[PDB]
Design a protein around this ligand. Sequence first.
Ligand SMILES: [Hg+2]
Ligand SMILES: [Hg+2]
Ligand SMILES: [Hg+2]
Ligand SMILES: [Hg+2]
Ligand SMILES: [Hg+2]
Length: 261
Amino acid sequence: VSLPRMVYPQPKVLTPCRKDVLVVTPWLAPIVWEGTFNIDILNEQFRLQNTTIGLTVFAIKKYVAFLKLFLETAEKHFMVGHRVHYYVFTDQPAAVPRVTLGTGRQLSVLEVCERRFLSEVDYLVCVDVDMEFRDHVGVEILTPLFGTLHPSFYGSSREAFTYERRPQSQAYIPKDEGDFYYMGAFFGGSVQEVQRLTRACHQAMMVDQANGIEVWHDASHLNKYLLRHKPTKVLSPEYLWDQQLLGWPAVLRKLRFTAVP
Ligand SMILES: [Hg+2]
Ligand SMILES: [Hg+2]
Ligand SMILES: [Hg+2]
Ligand SMILES: [Hg+2]
Ligand SMILES: [Hg+2]
């Protein structure tokens, strides 16, 4: 359907807002930074499709302790205005805190789903639970397949990336290959694309197991997948930061989703 009439500042062809960072990859995927998007336009586009976002987190053992802060801050900052379905995978269903949710937002507790996700949500986002939302994380991220720049490596040359470097591993990436180092958390996309990815990772993990090989497990396989199946958006480190470890450098105008000491 058509967008309604909207009044906003004219984009200026000969005046980019961000001259300090790369905002598009060499395969023409946007790299999402503050100042690259008009959230009003994006919100309209996604609400006209009645978009439902699934947010998946694993909270096992001591990590259940992070759920309250995670969910309360997600209520304040994550996809506000859109339909959200939280999926909490946990070994302690009775320890999941009762957090009050906005309208159109639901939570499911799964005790520790393929067809279920296909029928319940349009996008899936996969994050770590020991995190909090500090600022807007919205529909600007949504796309068939996305990953997030690792905050420790976004300025590094690829030789420094801690990819899997053993050729015997399915996740092997040689020193002369690599676009980016993606964090092995905060990835997502359409349900179909996220299922393809997770299927691929699980198959490759089995093969490495069978060959007696186990560096960064989920992150090394993710990085191999995203090297071979290029993401359709890349999230800047605004979306995955640790202020205690890394500070607040000028290049980050917002710190949206961060580590919790
Ligand atoms: Hg801009
Ligand atoms: Hg997921
Ligand atoms: Hg997940
Ligand atoms: Hg993979
Ligand atoms: Hg993976």
